[PDB]
Design a protein around this ligand. Structure first.
Ligand SMILES: CC(C)=CCC1=C(O)C(CC=C(C)C)(CC=C(C)C)C(=O)C(C(=O)C(C)C)=C1O
Ligand SMILES: CC(C)=CCC1=C(O)C(CC=C(C)C)(CC=C(C)C)C(=O)C(C(=O)C(C)C)=C1O
Lengths: 249, 249
């Protein structure tokens, strides 16, 4: 059963989620495009028209970097609006964000992902996959997590656990961030047993937990893959530089 | 049989054609697009990618107007490079061009038209039709003319007959332009009988001739349709204004 302290956590968590997550990507514009994986782009005009992009043979980097910044921006507003986060030392908020930005983005990106059609529905924008080449970690992750069929509560809770990780470079309040994370995980574990008594959801809390661990490694591996592509062909935005620790030098 | 005077006409005609007709639209760029009939657009990137546009529900006007200007420009270089044209009074060259621009463009546009797939192949650009609604004059024209399966000689000759029309507003050398036109039509009529003795090509010269007459009316009707759309929603380019007689006032 959920305590009133648990109900209160989920609430202030769901609230921040609806206040900082533009599920129809309305305010995302002025973004770069490929000019003139295997992801095809689709842009449904406000007027009914449609612009479709098929890839060649890069090129889609600038755009993906703009989508990422719009996403990161939301994720940050998400953190600063949660009491538990706001009450930490400034330095620790930056350490935590730089730590989970990628993970929180992918967690949100998974909710607009369609496993049936293999596409990310982002408002008027669409990212379609061009099929057992889930040989791609990030890809198998989206399908696996999408398969679990989680509720919004579970997703925002996963976002909490990931955000408040004590095991992150430069985290000063190592102890607080840890207790907080334990509290979020407890609330999750409880929410599951209070609302999903069916056999199919047995071990759900643990699958979720393992998922967040996999996601942590994927995050480590992608950061590297990204910093390598950035070294030879700069594309990262000012905000991404700040997140991935680039000095502009 | 073709005289040496006829062979010479066709030649200086074919020459001007290859010198002013960019059949792969290479130097056509910096054009406007629909931002963010039933013609869908396709742009095959130099890198292998493809941008596809599906229409709604206008919008494609600006672009079509840019294609038209690139086309007109070619058609004008075509005229100024032909001896018979160059040797007319300046005033008469403008009268003739303003008269046939549309027709000469459609004549050239028909050679990159594919009746099998209903699309205009223009280099890296494609204009696909989105099927007995050849209820559209200009459309039935392209299919009919494409059906005749003409040779390049015949097309450039049709371009001549159309360009040197004495029956055009403001033509001073009414008499010369007439004899010239008669000469081009004779050469055509001759080329046909010297190279197409098969039953299928009987009356070809006359079909061609009727076609140019239909095209003349279509031209009259489209100019009007265009000037009407221009009055409410200006899109025509400086060059089109000059051709359709707009003062910029
Ligand atoms: C266009 C979409 C939805 C995903 C492609 C994509 C991605 O969205 C990501 C990872 C996400 C995936 C592969 C679903 C994130 C993108 C940026 C940080 C710009 C990604 O890291 C990536 C890479 O190529 C890295 C390995 C450098 C990537 O290509
Ligand atoms: C996009 C393509 C190849 C054809 C569409 C098209 C055209 O290409 C034309 C006529 C040609 C057709 C319909 C094959 C010419 C276009 C301009 C002068 C900009 C045309 O007149 C037209 C019109 O709508 C008029 C009636 C105003 C037109 O829509």
């Amino acid at each position: 059963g959920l305590t009133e302290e648990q109900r209160m956590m989920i609430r202030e968590l769901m609230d921040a989620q609806m206040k900082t997550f533009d599920t129809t990507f309305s305010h995302f514009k002025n973004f770069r495009l490929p000019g003139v994986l295997k992801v095809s782009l689709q842009l449904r005009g406000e007027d009914g028209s449609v612009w479709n992009y098929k890839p060649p043979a890069f090129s889609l980097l600038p755009h993906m970097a703009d989508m990422s910044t719009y996403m990161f921006k939301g994720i940050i507003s998400f953190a600063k609006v949660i009491s538990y986060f706001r009450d930490l030392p400034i330095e620790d908020q930056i350490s935590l964000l730089k730590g989970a930005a990628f993970e929180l983005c992918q967690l949100r990106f998974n909710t607009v992902f369609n496993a049936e059609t293999g596409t990310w529905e982002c408002g008027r924008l669409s990212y379609c996959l061009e099929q057992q080449l889930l040989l791609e970690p990030m890809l198998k992750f989206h399908y696996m997590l999408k398969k679990l069929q989680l509720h919004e509560e579970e997703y925002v809770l996963m976002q909490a656990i990931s955000l408040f990780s004590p095991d992150r470079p430069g985290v000063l309040q190592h102890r607080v961030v840890d207790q907080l994370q334990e509290q979020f995980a407890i609330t999750l574990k409880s929410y599951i047993e209070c609302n999903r008594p069916q056999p199919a959801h047995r071990f759900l809390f643990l699958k979720i937990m393992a998922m967040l661990t996999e996601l942590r490694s994927i995050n480590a591996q992608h950061t590297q893959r990204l910093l390598r592509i950035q070294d030879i062909h700069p594309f990262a935005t000012p905000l991404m530089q700040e997140l991935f620790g680039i000095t502009g030098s």
